[PDB]
Amino acid sequence: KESGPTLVKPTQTLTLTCKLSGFSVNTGGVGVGWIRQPPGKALEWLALIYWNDDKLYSPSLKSRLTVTKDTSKNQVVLTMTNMDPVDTATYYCAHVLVWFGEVLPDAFDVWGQGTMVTV
Amino acid sequence: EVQLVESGGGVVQPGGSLRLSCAASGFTFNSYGMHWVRQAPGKGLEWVAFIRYDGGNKYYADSVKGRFTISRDNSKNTLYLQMKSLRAEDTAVYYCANLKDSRYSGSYYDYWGQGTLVTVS
Amino acid sequence: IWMTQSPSSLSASVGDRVTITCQASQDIRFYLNWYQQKPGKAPKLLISDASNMETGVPSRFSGSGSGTDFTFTISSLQPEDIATYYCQQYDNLPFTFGPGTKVDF
Amino acid sequence: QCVNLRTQLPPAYTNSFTRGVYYPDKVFRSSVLHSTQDLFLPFFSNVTWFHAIHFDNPVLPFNDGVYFASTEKSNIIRGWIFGTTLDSKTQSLLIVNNATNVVIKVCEFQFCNDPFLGVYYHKNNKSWMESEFRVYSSANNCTFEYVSQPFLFKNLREFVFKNIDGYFKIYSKHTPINLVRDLPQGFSALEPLVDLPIGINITRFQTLLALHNSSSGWTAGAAAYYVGYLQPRTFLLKYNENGTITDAVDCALDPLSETKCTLKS
Amino acid sequence: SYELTQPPSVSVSPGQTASITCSGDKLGETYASWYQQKPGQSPILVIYQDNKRPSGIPERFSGSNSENTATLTISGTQTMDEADYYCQAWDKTIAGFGGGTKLTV
Ligand SMILES: *[C@@H]1O[C@H](CO)[C@@H](O[C@@H]2O[C@H](CO)[C@@H](O[C@@H]3O[C@H](CO)[C@@H](O)[C@H](O)[C@@H]3O)[C@H](O)[C@H]2NC(C)=O)[C@H](O)[C@H]1NC(C)=O
Ligand SMILES: *[C@@H]1O[C@H](CO)[C@@H](O[C@@H]2O[C@H](CO)[C@@H](O)[C@H](O)[C@H]2NC(C)=O)[C@H](O)[C@H]1NC(C)=O
Ligand SMILES: *[C@@H]1O[C@H](CO)[C@@H](O[C@@H]2O[C@H](CO)[C@@H](O)[C@H](O)[C@H]2NC(C)=O)[C@H](O)[C@H]1NC(C)=O
Ligand SMILES: *[C@@H]1O[C@H](CO)[C@@H](O)[C@H](O)[C@H]1NC(C)=O
Ligand SMILES: *[C@@H]1O[C@H](CO)[C@@H](O)[C@H](O)[C@H]1NC(C)=O
Ligand SMILES: *[C@@H]1O[C@H](CO)[C@@H](O)[C@H](O)[C@H]1NC(C)=O
Ligand SMILES: *[C@@H]1O[C@H](CO)[C@@H](O)[C@H](O)[C@H]1NC(C)=O
Ligand SMILES: *[C@@H]1O[C@H](CO)[C@@H](O)[C@H](O)[C@H]1NC(C)=O
């Protein structure tokens, strides 16, 4: 369940929080990813965080993205900096399935509801 | 593939002695304890002696205790039974065996030899 | 620990149900083996730990019991099942075998 | 849950050389020759060499303690089962590693005829994911539970399993090896890993592997392991300046070793 | 991101079989997945690892991945299935999504 600010100015930093349930964020095999979807557009991957604190980011946005997790509240926090008007989108969080041999990503199965962000 | 072969049988006189042996192959002999069991003609099975895998602790049946000695050599995979002061009552076919035993031996498999006849006359 | 079996002998035809009783003078929980011996051959193990069937043993064979009273059963006697059956305890050393029950045709 | 799955081959043997030595206690010592009597793997003993995949994984005796070693990089070996009748009649000890942790339980387990863990592989051969747990059909009457971090050139892993006065003690060491199919000739002592206050009898044990389902049936990579047994022997342990054991003498090996132990050389 | 190409739409009548495809350069070398999305709602995973359904997903869904083309199939397409379907795949841990196919029922 995504929550946070809905309206920000250009060149501002936005922080969004995903509240998870049914599992703990500290449980092995667990991961959480963030995806955005501009109005009328396809899904765009932002970043993901694994239970082992490892992280991956989309190269085109990595420089403006930070992902951390709260191990006490079972919450994941996404921060995006210097947002432009073109970054207006609905933000989603979802559970990330991961391979164990080599740490490769698989699929996003459990999704939130989506929070609309206007810059 | 698993074999146990007894030898050293024959005919002896009362008060005499006889050394029996059993050659083991096809399995990890030095990991298992071993038993001797005898069966007289027309009779049922009787347990004789048991030795642990390391050749340390030894156990005997009351009927042979003080007369028989059990031993083994793990470098040759050979089990031995040394019998002294043999009596007419000791006439029987002697088997070497690895009996299935979840308390003392820890054996999950049950193996038997062929049997060698010892006669006292 | 003294062992005994009953009956000392029995006879039955093919398809008959055969039961053999084994008793111990002491409580040996579930640490008893059942063996089948045919003339001229070494004994073969059929059942261990009172009721655990060995691999390769036909499903017609079964057994149960604990403490001082154990039972061995053949649900449908076959012509190849004519043998002497023994019970053996391995709860405490020295180990012993029972008298042996002879099953005829 | 359980799957019915076996050809047995005659055993192979290897030379243990001077391996299987471990720290007898937790007391720090340095620059000293210390004589101790404990259960150790006898020097130059014959160790049984098993090949899980030529397929069977036989139940072995525990005797008075077990030395276990393996050289595999595929993470096929996951754990061990220790107990007596290995069924619902008695309590059994189940030690199993998985993707992130190790779980140790003592329960009246009703184990499968040929227990294992199921996995499957990625499109490539460098990645895998868990499928199903197929070790036992049921478990009840649980008395002990413990959870911690995983226990598991080539990677050589060595373990020692002891059961004294109800305490199940595990020692371990992990080193690199540059041999194809043998044990290394050198010296390295094993360190304490975990001490479990369980209080049960162990007479037999079995190794648990992770198998995958192929078109030819359930199988695995070329997993293999070595099994030896401990004996009550006297060892002279050499502690260096930093308190690490760098050598040892088996006082029961021969007259020469007896002389060395007597003269503390 | 990883390149994924989809047709803009598929048009079927209710009760008919829908065929929604997605292509790429390395698609057949990896695992494909499919999502079902409606306006104002999050996407739902319907197929993962080429042909596996998540629990709760109707048996109407099936699929495959060959010749670098992934396909989602809906048997007996319902009006409730009128949604935009997306393909997803990874390339060396880099994500990517297709344009999205509008399914009209
Ligand atoms: C590898 O082994 C670990 C350790 O056993 C597994 O983690 C454990 O998973 C179980 C579920 O199968 C968790 O139990 C559940 O906990 C929740 C707490 O919210 C409770 O509500 C449920 O009713 C149930 O009791 C257990 O807590 C968890 N333990 C730890 C330390 O995380 C793990 O799933 C196994 N597999 C993998 C891939 O890691
Ligand atoms: C380990 O096993 C080997 C055999 O594979 C043993 O070597 C044999 O020992 C006997 C008895 O001394 C000799 O008669 C043979 O000639 C030896 N064979 C070979 C090839 O050397 C060895 O002694 C065993 N070691 C231990 C500790 O049991
Ligand atoms: C675990 O094994 C020990 C043997 O090492 C068992 O102790 C024996 O129990 C029997 C039955 O009460 C006694 O007659 C023996 O004298 C005991 N031997 C010793 C050395 O104490 C113990 O009972 C076993 N535990 C369980 C649960 O079976
Ligand atoms: C395995 O075969 C035995 C019969 O020998 C049967 O009783 C058992 O249920 C089977 N187990 C499985 C998992 O098929
Ligand atoms: C994986 O192994 C199979 C052989 O079983 C081989 O055909 C395939 O090309 C290998 N794939 C990779 C990425 O190594
Ligand atoms: C073990 O659990 C069973 C229930 O499955 C119960 O009937 C039995 O009494 C329990 N035994 C012990 C020693 O707890
Ligand atoms: C294993 O593979 C065989 C052959 O495809 C299949 O019949 C069997 O059901 C599979 N077993 C499992 C648990 O997937
Ligand atoms: C002890 O450790 C130091 C490093 O702190 C190392 O330089 C020295 O060689 C070590 N001594 C021995 C005997 O290993």
Numbering used by the authors:
A (entry chain H): 5 to 123
B (entry chain B): 1 to 121
C (entry chain C): 2 to 106
D (entry chain A): 14 to 18, 21 to 69, 79 to 176, 186 to 298
E (entry chain L): 1 to 105
From the paper:
Kimura et al., Wang et al., and Acevedo et al. showed that Lambda exhibited reduced neutralization sensitivity to antibodies induced by both vaccination and prior infection, with evidence suggesting that these effects were caused by the L452Q, F490S, and RSYLTPGD246-253N mutations. At the time it emerged, many studies indeed predicted higher resistance to RBD bnAbs, infectivity, and higher likelihood to escape vaccines in the Lambda variant compared to contemporary variants.
Local classification and refinement of the NTD bound to S2L20 and S2X303 improved local resolution of this region, permitting model building, including the R246N mutation and the 247–253 deletion (commonly referred to as the “RSYLTPGD246-253N” mutation). As R246A or R246Q point mutations in the Lambda spike abolish this glycan sequon and do not affect neutralization of BNT162b2 vaccine recipient sera, the 247–253 deletion rather than the new glycan may be solely responsible for the association of the RSYLTPGD246-253N mutation with decreased VE. Of the 16 AA positions significantly associated with VE in Latin America, the Lambda variant mutation RSYLTPGD246-253N, RSYLTPGD with the N246 glycan in the NTD supersite epitope, was associated with decreased VE after phylogenetic correction (FDR-adjusted p < 0.2).
